[PDB]
CSV table of C-alpha atoms in Angstrom, one decimal:
chain,number,residue,atom,x,y,z
I,1041,UNK,CA,-5.5,110.5,62.8
I,1042,UNK,CA,-7.8,113.5,61.3
I,1043,UNK,CA,-8.6,115.8,64.6
I,1044,UNK,CA,-8.9,120.0,64.3
I,1045,UNK,CA,-7.8,121.2,68.5
I,1046,UNK,CA,-10.0,123.9,66.9
I,1047,UNK,CA,-13.3,122.4,66.0
I,1048,UNK,CA,-15.9,124.7,64.2
I,1049,UNK,CA,-18.3,124.1,67.3
I,1050,UNK,CA,-19.1,126.8,69.5
I,1051,UNK,CA,-21.9,129.0,70.8
I,1052,UNK,CA,-22.4,132.8,72.1
I,1053,UNK,CA,-21.9,132.6,76.1
I,1054,UNK,CA,-25.1,132.5,78.3
I,1055,UNK,CA,-26.7,132.4,81.7
I,1056,UNK,CA,-29.0,130.7,80.8
L,1490,UNK,CA,-19.9,98.5,82.3
L,1491,UNK,CA,-22.6,101.2,82.7
L,1492,UNK,CA,-21.6,104.5,84.6
L,1493,UNK,CA,-19.4,102.7,86.4
L,1494,UNK,CA,-14.7,104.4,86.7
L,1495,UNK,CA,-14.2,102.7,83.9
L,1496,UNK,CA,-16.9,102.7,80.8
L,1497,UNK,CA,-15.1,106.2,79.9
L,1498,UNK,CA,-11.8,105.2,80.6
L,1499,UNK,CA,-11.8,101.9,78.5
L,1500,UNK,CA,-12.8,105.0,75.9
L,1501,UNK,CA,-9.7,106.8,76.8
L,1502,UNK,CA,-7.8,103.3,75.7
L,1503,UNK,CA,-9.5,103.2,72.3
L,1504,UNK,CA,-9.2,106.7,71.0
L,1505,UNK,CA,-8.1,107.7,68.0
L,1506,UNK,CA,-6.6,111.2,66.6
L,1507,UNK,CA,-9.0,111.5,64.1
L,1508,UNK,CA,-12.4,113.7,63.7
L,1509,UNK,CA,-14.2,110.7,64.1
L,1510,UNK,CA,-13.2,108.9,66.2
L,1511,UNK,CA,-13.3,111.8,69.1
L,1512,UNK,CA,-16.7,112.3,67.6
L,1513,UNK,CA,-18.3,109.4,68.1
L,1514,UNK,CA,-15.9,109.6,71.7
L,1515,UNK,CA,-17.2,112.5,71.8
L,1516,UNK,CA,-21.1,112.2,71.2
L,1517,UNK,CA,-21.7,108.9,73.4
L,1518,UNK,CA,-19.6,110.7,76.6
L,1519,UNK,CA,-22.0,113.3,75.8
L,1520,UNK,CA,-24.9,111.6,75.6
L,1521,UNK,CA,-24.0,110.5,79.8
L,1522,UNK,CA,-23.2,114.2,81.2
L,1523,UNK,CA,-24.6,112.8,84.2
L,1524,UNK,CA,-21.2,111.2,84.5
L,1525,UNK,CA,-18.9,114.7,83.9
L,1526,UNK,CA,-17.5,115.5,87.5
L,1527,UNK,CA,-16.6,111.7,87.6
L,1528,UNK,CA,-15.3,111.4,84.2
L,1529,UNK,CA,-13.6,114.9,84.7
L,1530,UNK,CA,-11.6,113.2,87.6
L,1531,UNK,CA,-10.9,109.9,86.1
L,1532,UNK,CA,-9.8,111.7,82.7
L,1533,UNK,CA,-6.5,113.6,84.8
L,1534,UNK,CA,-5.8,110.7,87.0
L,1535,UNK,CA,-5.7,108.9,84.0
L,1536,UNK,CA,-3.1,111.0,81.7
L,1537,UNK,CA,-1.3,112.4,85.0
L,1538,UNK,CA,-0.8,108.8,85.8
L,1539,UNK,CA,3.2,107.3,84.9
L,1540,UNK,CA,1.5,104.5,82.9
L,1541,UNK,CA,0.4,106.7,79.9
L,1542,UNK,CA,2.1,108.2,77.2
L,1543,UNK,CA,2.2,110.8,75.0
L,1544,UNK,CA,-0.4,109.9,72.3
L,1545,UNK,CA,-3.0,108.1,74.3
L,1546,UNK,CA,-2.4,112.1,76.2
L,1547,UNK,CA,-2.8,113.7,72.6
L,1548,UNK,CA,-5.9,111.4,72.4
L,1549,UNK,CA,-7.4,112.0,75.6
L,1550,UNK,CA,-6.6,116.2,75.0
L,1551,UNK,CA,-8.6,116.0,71.5
L,1552,UNK,CA,-11.5,114.3,73.5
L,1553,UNK,CA,-11.8,116.1,76.3
L,1554,UNK,CA,-11.3,119.1,73.9
L,1555,UNK,CA,-14.0,117.6,72.0
L,1556,UNK,CA,-16.5,117.5,74.6
L,1557,UNK,CA,-16.1,120.8,76.8
L,1558,UNK,CA,-16.6,122.5,73.1
L,1559,UNK,CA,-19.6,120.7,72.4
L,1560,UNK,CA,-20.6,121.1,76.0
L,1561,UNK,CA,-20.4,124.9,75.5
L,1562,UNK,CA,-22.2,124.3,72.5
L,1563,UNK,CA,-25.9,123.2,73.4
L,1564,UNK,CA,-24.8,125.3,77.4
L,1565,UNK,CA,-24.1,121.1,79.5
L,1566,UNK,CA,-22.0,123.6,81.9
L,1567,UNK,CA,-21.9,120.1,83.7
L,1568,UNK,CA,-18.8,119.4,81.6
L,1569,UNK,CA,-16.9,122.3,81.1
L,1570,UNK,CA,-17.4,123.3,84.7
L,1571,UNK,CA,-15.8,119.8,85.8
L,1572,UNK,CA,-13.3,119.4,82.8
L,1573,UNK,CA,-12.0,122.3,82.8
L,1574,UNK,CA,-10.5,122.6,86.6
L,1575,UNK,CA,-9.1,119.3,86.2
L,1576,UNK,CA,-8.3,120.9,82.6
L,1577,UNK,CA,-5.6,123.3,84.1
L,1578,UNK,CA,-3.2,120.0,85.7
L,1579,UNK,CA,-3.5,117.8,82.5
L,1580,UNK,CA,-2.8,120.5,80.2
L,1581,UNK,CA,-0.9,121.7,82.9
L,1582,UNK,CA,1.4,118.4,82.9
L,1583,UNK,CA,1.0,116.4,79.7
L,1584,UNK,CA,2.6,120.6,78.6
L,1585,UNK,CA,5.6,118.9,80.4
L,1586,UNK,CA,5.8,116.1,78.7
L,1587,UNK,CA,5.3,116.7,75.0
L,1588,UNK,CA,7.6,117.3,72.3
L,1589,UNK,CA,7.4,120.3,70.8
L,1590,UNK,CA,4.9,119.4,68.3
L,1591,UNK,CA,2.7,118.1,70.1
L,1592,UNK,CA,2.4,121.0,72.1
L,1593,UNK,CA,1.7,123.1,69.6
L,1594,UNK,CA,-1.3,120.9,68.9
L,1595,UNK,CA,-1.7,121.8,72.8
L,1596,UNK,CA,-0.9,125.7,72.8
L,1597,UNK,CA,-4.0,125.9,70.4
L,1598,UNK,CA,-6.6,123.6,72.4
L,1599,UNK,CA,-5.8,126.2,75.0
L,1600,UNK,CA,-5.8,129.0,72.7
L,1601,UNK,CA,-9.2,128.5,71.6
L,1602,UNK,CA,-10.3,127.6,74.7
L,1603,UNK,CA,-9.8,130.7,76.2
L,1604,UNK,CA,-10.9,133.0,72.9
L,1605,UNK,CA,-13.8,131.1,73.3
L,1606,UNK,CA,-14.2,131.1,76.9
L,1607,UNK,CA,-15.3,127.5,77.2
L,1608,UNK,CA,-14.1,127.2,80.8
L,1609,UNK,CA,-14.2,129.8,83.5
L,1610,UNK,CA,-11.6,132.8,83.3
L,1611,UNK,CA,-9.6,131.7,86.9
L,1612,UNK,CA,-9.4,127.9,84.7
L,1613,UNK,CA,-8.0,129.8,81.4
L,1614,UNK,CA,-5.5,131.6,84.0
L,1615,UNK,CA,-4.8,128.0,86.4
L,1616,UNK,CA,-4.3,126.6,82.5
L,1617,UNK,CA,-1.9,129.6,82.1
L,1618,UNK,CA,0.1,129.4,84.9
L,1619,UNK,CA,0.3,125.7,84.7
L,1620,UNK,CA,1.8,125.9,81.4
L,1621,UNK,CA,4.2,129.0,82.2
L,1622,UNK,CA,5.4,127.0,85.9
L,1623,UNK,CA,7.0,124.0,83.7
L,1624,UNK,CA,9.5,126.9,82.1
L,1625,UNK,CA,9.4,129.6,84.6
L,1626,UNK,CA,8.4,132.7,82.4
L,1627,UNK,CA,4.9,134.6,82.1
L,1628,UNK,CA,2.3,137.6,80.4
L,1629,UNK,CA,1.4,140.7,81.3
L,1630,UNK,CA,-2.5,139.9,80.0
L,1631,UNK,CA,-4.8,136.6,80.4
């Protein structure tokens, strides 16, 4: 095991 | 089998709590976003089943967490839309079974989730309500 419940992956919110 | 009510399910039975095991399972599941609503349902039912253990639930939590997170990353709302609703159940029911330590890992998942708003605030609240109902305690903000 080694997974992060956080992760560096994310992106701004957008309606499209 | 392909797109069966079992492909994603067999994945759950072969996950590992590590970055790449989850990443390989995530990137694949991400390729079949068509199955997003179905997999969200099968995912919850698999976690809510009495025949699953805390580790398999932790694995499922990590898989869906990467899936919904990476989904928002490329704006694949089908995942975060479907998974979000069933999340409140799973995360909130496994919260009643996870020992303090796995529950801490989930607590971060619920945190980063609403911090980044991977789901809708209603879904965020429903997850919080589910965790809350496990010990009947609440907070003045959501």
